[PDB]
Amino acid sequence: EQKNAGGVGELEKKAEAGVQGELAEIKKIAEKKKDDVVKILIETVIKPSAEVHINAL
Amino acid sequence: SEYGAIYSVSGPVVIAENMIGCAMYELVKVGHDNLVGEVIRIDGDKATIQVYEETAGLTVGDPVLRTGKPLSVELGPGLMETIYDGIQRPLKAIKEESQSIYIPRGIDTPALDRTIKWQFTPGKFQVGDHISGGDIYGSVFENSLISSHKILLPPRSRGTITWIAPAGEYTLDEKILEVEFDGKKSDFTLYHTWPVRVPRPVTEKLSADYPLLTGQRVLDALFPCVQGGTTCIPGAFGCGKTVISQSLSKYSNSDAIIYVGCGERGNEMAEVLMEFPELYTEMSGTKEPIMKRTTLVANTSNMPVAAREASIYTGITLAEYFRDQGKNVSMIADSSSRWAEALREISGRLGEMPADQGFPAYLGAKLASFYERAGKAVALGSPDRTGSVSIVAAVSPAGGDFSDPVTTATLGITQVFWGLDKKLAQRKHFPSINTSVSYSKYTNVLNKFYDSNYPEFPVLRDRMKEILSNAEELEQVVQLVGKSALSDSDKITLDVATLIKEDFLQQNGYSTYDAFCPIWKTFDMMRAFISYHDEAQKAVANGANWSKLADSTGDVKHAVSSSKFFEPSRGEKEVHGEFEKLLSTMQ
Amino acid sequence: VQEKKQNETA
Amino acid sequence: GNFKSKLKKAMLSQQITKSTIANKMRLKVLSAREQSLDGIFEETKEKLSGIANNRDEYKPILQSLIVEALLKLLEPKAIVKALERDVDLIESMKDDIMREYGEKAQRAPLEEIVISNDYLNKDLVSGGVVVSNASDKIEINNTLEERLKLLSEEALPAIRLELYGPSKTRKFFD
Amino acid sequence: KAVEQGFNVKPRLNYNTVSGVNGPLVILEKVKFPRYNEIVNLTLPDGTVRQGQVLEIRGDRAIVQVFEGTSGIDVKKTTVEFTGESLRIPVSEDMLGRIFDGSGRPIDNGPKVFAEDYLDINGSPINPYARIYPEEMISTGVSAIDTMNSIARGQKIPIFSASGLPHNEIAAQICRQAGLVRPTKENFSIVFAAMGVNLETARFFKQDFEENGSLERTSLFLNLANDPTIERIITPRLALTTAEYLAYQTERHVLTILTDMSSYADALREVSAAREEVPGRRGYPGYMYTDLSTIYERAGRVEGRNGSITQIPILTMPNDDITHPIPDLTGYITEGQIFVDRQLHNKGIYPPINVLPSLSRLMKSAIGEGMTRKDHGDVSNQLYAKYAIGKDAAAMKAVVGEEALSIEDKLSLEFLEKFEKTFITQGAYEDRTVFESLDQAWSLLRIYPKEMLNRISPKILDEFYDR
Ligand SMILES: Nc1ncnc2c1ncn2[C@@H]1O[C@H](COP(=O)(O)OP(=O)(O)O)[C@@H](O)[C@H]1O
Ligand SMILES: [Mg+2]
């Protein structure tokens, strides 16, 4: 019965291949929407919220 | 201006500055969310506020708006069959408005539904008549159980009815009465607000003389309460203080129930909202949901500690309002020790000197003032009506110790003490009432009632108390020296007391035959048990062997024990067959 | 506790 | 009994190997997503540096940052740490900053603005200022790097909606 | 959307005005509009960053409790930055299958959580009108719980144990075997918070989640006994905000256990003593019922969401004293308690659950016609009656001997031996169905004659007493 250790040793490199589909999808989504995300990030960073505290009157 | 500023925040206590010209116990809106709080102390321009919401996020400098009014409760139609948030705002409407499973901070919702049209019908007063506070100037049909909700003038209002509305359907905001006093005209709708911290006036305080017939044999027979009395139920954390409270709310004589959950589970206020509609009362002549006459004041433990105090005021004020309509209300306050902990938590964060166990020195005064609101009274104004407010306060002693400050104070104040025993609750002996220490000071007055309905009741009660005390003292001996070293009389006493405990005092509150036990059934069972004891004592007194007689009369004992199982449904004189099928089948 | 409160915060 | 226990141990070893492989795959997906987000933020940092290097386009931003920090401090006198690149640019705009703080705070104009001789580390800071109380105790780090660092945490749930859209299981939002 | 408001930069004030450090507490002196309950970041002279919670504000003064401890903090070079918000945890369904600090930082070598939201760890009390009363019984597999202390899905029932007792094994068995008696048509998600536990306790729980494949469904929040003490005041709220997000936000039936909730009480007393507040019993804070109820009551079901939180806090009673403040106030807040007993444990029994101090507040409604079985309540009550009488027969035999205890006492001694050694005794990984456990209860009540089973009504005594 000890032979199943090799069987589990082979389980890696199988799901490591199945997950590459989702990894590629992540990369594609990044390449698509990264420009927009960066645009909003920049406009938020340089946009000033120059207002005093509410309680400062 | 009306705007002070938050100076300090610590737990539920907010100290605000620029609060000069602020009155004690005045409501205030704290912060930008407009959290409701009450000015508890004034020191110069600094006002200390107990916030009734979560203070997380409150900033120093946040506005504090005076409202000019005390913590008030709205009183009028639409009050039964409803559950409220410690303060007087409604939880169902809150859920419907916020469309969420939480209670938003600072949400404002009118306490009474202002869109329901109520069928007002004017009373006996006409234009030009003089009206004063408490005068029933009309009635509305609220529900099939509360078929005539009296419309009373506010207690502190007066004048000559300049105008009275005709019979018809009016919302709560529609004007119903105009009354001129000193040339000034005042307008009265179907509801009015009353300060929850001021007791509602009465013409005179009567003497409570009618029993508060719960469904429990031990509480009805051994330690009775009256309508208008004060009782406390100290106990540990699983001995049934909340099951007793709910059974009383279900089967008590009270025309209305104010169930206050001051710092309790939110699944125990949910079960009341689930079972009371499914439970019905034929006190109106037809089965009407007990919920139709039972309102709720849900303020769980996860909910602000400072609203555990506004939960107890709201409940007693509602009971006083309904007593002012001629009703015999029962306020069930589960728990009074959570309101005392809230005052211990406010006092500790407030700086003044703590007492014996951190409680304020004025805890006893607060409890006394709360319990002094209960009683039988003639209601202010005409028609002449009489009402009563009973208070059933569950105390939760820290560790089950009855020497606690809250428990000692309540025992000093209350007239009935239904002390619960944890050991009995573990055996599932329910109700787990400690007969050794529990007392009822209303047994003397109830004499009259018994002399009018059950003359043997006081004597039988005293006999059963004596038997139980003897058996308590004797079981201790038997636990060490054995039962065979006792006299036959002592063994009879032990057997009788065991039978009483396991069949008379023990009452399954979640069954059909023992969910409720009417007083006639209690009296019949008491007579049966005492007669069995007398028969055994006589049989052994004139010469007999109790050891064999127990086997000989085993079936008579079985019948006495099974008297418990009679269904009360076959009311009165069908169960009363036990008068012969039990007291003549033997004895 | 009482002594601390009285003699430090009063 | 020993044989049964040891076979149970073998089965549990098999199951644990399967579970560990699955967990490492899940963490691989999560780390890929995190690295994509980090790349987005790195590009944003490069763009912020570029904008900060454009003096004419950078001057209004720098004034707005200084005025915002001063409005948060609400101190009569302030100190401004800035890149040695911007000390000259800030010196030419002190009057504008003072007047703008006075008007936006509906308060008397700022009494005094020091420009600290301790310049921000140009290697790490690409723009903006650090505005400090007169005592140098209380400060606000209104730098482009710090602003982006704060946004990288405040805006994370919005970036996840932008990139990967709504989640199928979140049924109740709040 | 609501997430769109996150695209906003809010600069933070960095103060450097620390004026005192005593125990957990740091006092900071010249705050501008201090905010109650706000979270702050203390940068130490060493440069490490710690987090703290503003416990009190007074003018310009703020009192902050530092979760990671105040060691190494000085008044000169320590700066404190005020974030302006309370403590919010990032929450995604990708939290399931992950391990975090008591502060919510990943310790599985994975990345931070890609948040779908930042949810305040204090939550909000559920509207009592929005609550559903739990009535779906969970077969824990343990006869001492299923047959006499039956747990409903959505119930909050801790395990009152003590030290040297197998309360971790009992909780692991419950999590391992838990399921509905009548399945609706799925496995629980699990949220495990550990406060001040050993390393081998955490290892036991983690590897038993490994073994049963429930770790992919599990988020762990491990504050071990070598981690900061004050960080234990946030661990159970970060774990109950993650459990809540799965329970209502993702509609996931979840079972969330707050192991060593009793340890959290020690941290609450440490903070309270540092604040010199007026104490309760044994020095514990006078507000410990309100602090333990803001954790215990974050369980249950709600009307329109098909998810629940079943909470099993684990609580070790000092000196096995149930009147101690911690177990006492838990009993007054929770809907029952499974009482792990040292007398039964020394006596060789597992699970050493003493059913007499134990209770399930939601059992009455979870058992009966059509949903477990008709004899379940009567059988349970009769078993309690006979066990309470067998334990008093065994005390009378210890001082007096068998020769002077009645026949019923002998029957109760026999009942007590078989109850504890055959019914309450049960191997680990032995899953008994509520029906097998009722059949075994009927076999033990047959020891007695039909006439002394006086806590069973004649209808039930008729159908089951003779099978
Ligand atoms: N009269 C009774 N009949 C049956 N069970 C009862 C009775 N009284 C109490 N119990 C049981 O005791 C449990 C705990 O008591 P509870 O009502 O919560 O009171 P407390 O608040 O004092 O703990 C209840 O959930 C119920 O199972
Ligand atoms: Mg209670």
Contact B398 E279 (CB under 8 A): no
Interface test with chain E among A8, A26, A44, A54, by most E beta carbons within 10 Å: A44
Backbone torsions φ then ψ of B190, nearest 5 degrees: -75, -10
Residues E311, E389 contacting (CB under 8 angstroms): no
Query: Which one, of E436, E438, E443, lies nearest residue E465 by Cα?
Result: E443
List of residues 6+ apart from E443 with CB closer than 8 A: none
**Which residue's CA is the closest to the ligand 1 atom numbered 8?**
B240
Among B243, B300, B395, B427, residue to substitute to test ligand 1 (most atoms within 8 Å of Cβ) = B243
Residue reference for tokens 């002190």? D94
- Measured in whole angstroms, how far is the alpha carbon of residue B450 from the centre of its chain? 24
Query: Which one, of E12, E51, E45, E46, lies nearest residue E31 by Cα?
Result: E12
Q: Is the Cβ of E279 closer than 8 Å to some Cβ of chain C?
A: yes
- Binding residue numbers of B: 235-242
List of residues 6+ apart from E210 with CB closer than 8 A: D15, D16, D19, D20
CA A12 to CA A5: how far, in whole Å? 12
Query: Which one, of D145, D117, D114, lies nearest residue D131 by Cα?
Result: D114
List of residues 6+ apart from E221 with CB closer than 8 A: E100, E101, E102, E104, E191, E192, E193, E194, E235, E238, E239, E242
B236 contacts on E by Cβ (under 8 Å): 331
Which is it for the CA torsion D41, D45, D50, D54, positive or negative?
positive
Pick D39-165's CATH classification: 3.40.630.30, 3.90.1170.50, 3.30.2320.30, 1.20.272.10: 3.30.2320.30
CA B159 to CA B132: how far, in whole Å? 7
Helices (H), E215-341: 235-244, 261-274, 288-296, 325-331
Determine the distance separating the centroid of ligand 2 and the alpha carbon of B333, expressed in angstroms: 9
Q: What is the largest CA-CA distance in chain C?
A: 13
Query: Does residue B266 sit in helix, strand or coil?
Result: coil
Q: Extract the tokens encoding B490.
A: 């002592």
Q: Are strands B149-152 and B177-181 parallel, antiparallel or unpaired?
A: unpaired
Which is it for the CA torsion B185, B191, B197, B201, positive or negative?
positive
| Cβ of E332 less than 6 Å from ligand 1 | no
- What is the DSSP-derived secondary structure letter of residue B186? E
List of residues 6+ apart from D33 with CB closer than 8 A: A26, E111, E114
Burial D82-107 (b: 16+ CB within 10 A, else e): bbebbeeebeebbeebbebbeeebee
CA D36 to CA A26: how far, in whole Å? 8
Residues D125, D148 contacting (CB under 8 angstroms): no
- Measured in whole angstroms, how far is the alpha carbon of residue B192 from the centre of its chain? 23
CA B468 to CA B500: how far, in whole Å? 8
Nearest-atom index, ligand 1, CA of B508: 3
Determine the distance separating the centroid of ligand 1 and the alpha carbon of B245, expressed in angstroms: 10
| Cβ of B233 less than 6 Å from ligand 1 | no
Query: Which one, of E277, E70, E381, lies nearest residue B507 by Cα?
Result: E381
CA E194 to CA E231: how far, in whole Å? 11
E278 contacts on C by Cβ (under 8 Å): 1, 5
Do you find a cis peptide bond into B383, omega within 30 degrees of 0? Answer: yes
CA B360 to CA B358: how far, in whole Å? 7
Query: Which one, of B79, B164, B73, B165, lies nearest residue B116 by Cα?
Result: B79
Instruction: State the structure-solving technique.
Output: cryo-EM
Which is it for the CA torsion A22, A27, A31, A36, positive or negative?
positive
Query: Does residue E129 sit in helix, strand or coil?
Result: coil
A50–chain B nearest CA distance, Å: 20
Interface test with chain C among E58, E269, E276, E277, by most C beta carbons within 10 Å: E276
List of residues 6+ apart from E110 with CB closer than 8 A: D27, D30, D31, E98
Helices (H), chain D: 2-53, 55-73, 87-91, 94-104, 144-154, 156-164
B63 contacts on A by Cβ (under 8 Å): 55
Distances (CA, A) of E436 to B116, B243, E104, E401, E460: 54, 30, 42, 35, 17
- Which one of the ligands is nearest to B216 CA? 1
| Cβ of E361 less than 6 Å from ligand 1 | yes
CA E428 to CA D8: how far, in whole Å? 14
Residues E290, B345 contacting (CB under 8 angstroms): yes
| Cβ of B241 less than 6 Å from ligand 1 | yes
A50 contacts on D by Cβ (under 8 Å): 64, 67-68, 71, 104
Which chains reach chain A with 3 or more Cβ–Cβ distances below 8 angstroms?
Answer: B, D, E
| Cβ of B235 less than 6 Å from ligand 1 | yes
Surrounding ion ligand 2 within 5 Å at CB are B 241-242, 335
Burial E296-320 (b: 16+ CB within 10 A, else e): bbbbbbbeebebbbbbbbbbbbeeb
Q: Give E420: exposed, middle or buried? Use CB within 10 Å, 0-12, 13-18, 19+.
A: buried
Contact E36 B57 (CB under 8 A): yes
Q: Give B203: exposed, middle or buried? Use CB within 10 Å, 0-12, 13-18, 19+.
A: middle
Distances (CA, A) of B301 to B151, B448, E267: 35, 43, 21
CA B29 to CA B24: how far, in whole Å? 15
Contact E33 A44 (CB under 8 A): no
Determine the distance separating the centroid of ligand 1 and the alpha carbon of B242, expressed in angstroms: 6
Q: Report the first-to-last Cα separation within chain B, whole angstroms.
A: 83
Residues E81, E109 contacting (CB under 8 angstroms): no
Q: Which residue spans within B335-491 are E strands per DSSP?
A: 375-379, 386-394, 416-417, 439-440
E272–chain C nearest CA distance, Å: 12
D7 contacts on A by Cβ (under 8 Å): 1
Nearest-atom index, ligand 1, CA of B432: 8
**Which residue's CA is the closest to the ligand 1 atom numbered 10?**
B240
Q: Extract the tokens encoding E147.
A: 């047959």
Question: How is B61-88 classified by DSSP, letter by letter?
Answer: T-EEEEEEEESEEEESSS-TT-BB-SSS
Resolution limit, Å: 2.7
Residue type, D18: K
CA B442 to CA D10: how far, in whole Å? 73
CA E88 to CA D90: how far, in whole Å? 37
| Cβ of B431 less than 6 Å from ligand 1 | yes
CA B515 to CA B444: how far, in whole Å? 28
Question: How is E146-185 classified by DSSP, letter by letter?
Answer: HTTSPPBTT-B--EEE-TTS-HHHHHHHHHHH-EESS---
| Cβ of B77 less than 6 Å from ligand 1 | no
Residues 16-35, chain A: which have Cβ within 8 Å of D? 16, 18-19, 22-23, 26-27, 29-30, 33-34
CA E332 to CA E309: how far, in whole Å? 19
- Binding residue numbers of E for ATP: 361
- Binding residue numbers of B for ATP: 235-242
Contact E278 C4 (CB under 8 A): no
Query: Does residue E278 sit in helix, strand or coil?
Result: coil
E10 contacts on A by Cβ (under 8 Å): 49
- Measured in whole angstroms, how far is the alpha carbon of residue B151 from the centre of its chain? 24
B7: closest chain A residue by CA: A55
Q: Extract the tokens encoding B125.
A: 């007063």
Helices (H), E325-457: 325-331, 342-346, 363-366, 376-400, 407-418, 434-445
Residue reference for tokens 């059934």? B521
| Cβ of B395 less than 6 Å from ligand 1 | no
Residues E132, E303 contacting (CB under 8 angstroms): yes
Which chains reach chain B with 3 or more Cβ–Cβ distances below 8 angstroms?
Answer: A, C, E
Query: Which one, of B230, B271, B220, B235, lies nearest residue B521 by Cα?
Result: B220
Distances (CA, A) of B209 to B29, B227, B380, B445, E226: 45, 7, 20, 6, 65
**Which residue's CA is the closest to the ligand 1 atom numbered 12?**
B240
Distances (CA, A) of E367 to B380, E136, E153, E378: 50, 9, 13, 10
The angle formed by the CA atoms of residues E395, E398 and E404, to the nearest 5 degrees, is 90
E97: closest chain D residue by CA: D23
Which is it for the CA torsion A39, A41, A43, A46, positive or negative?
negative
**Other CB atoms closer than 10 Å to residue D167's CB: what's the count?**
16
Which of E8, E32, E33 has the CB atom closest to A49's CB atom?
Answer: E8
Contact A56 B61 (CB under 8 A): yes
Helices and strands: H and E segment counts in chain E: 13, 22
Query: Which one, of B366, C9, B16, lies nearest residue E278 by Cα?
Result: C9
- What is the DSSP-derived secondary structure letter of residue B199? P
Determine the distance separating the centroid of ligand 2 and the alpha carbon of B396, expressed in angstroms: 7
| Cβ of B229 less than 6 Å from ligand 1 | no
Dihedral class, residue B201 (left if φ above 0, else alpha if ψ from -120 to 50, else beta): beta
E283: closest chain C residue by CA: C1
D34–chain E nearest CA distance, Å: 7
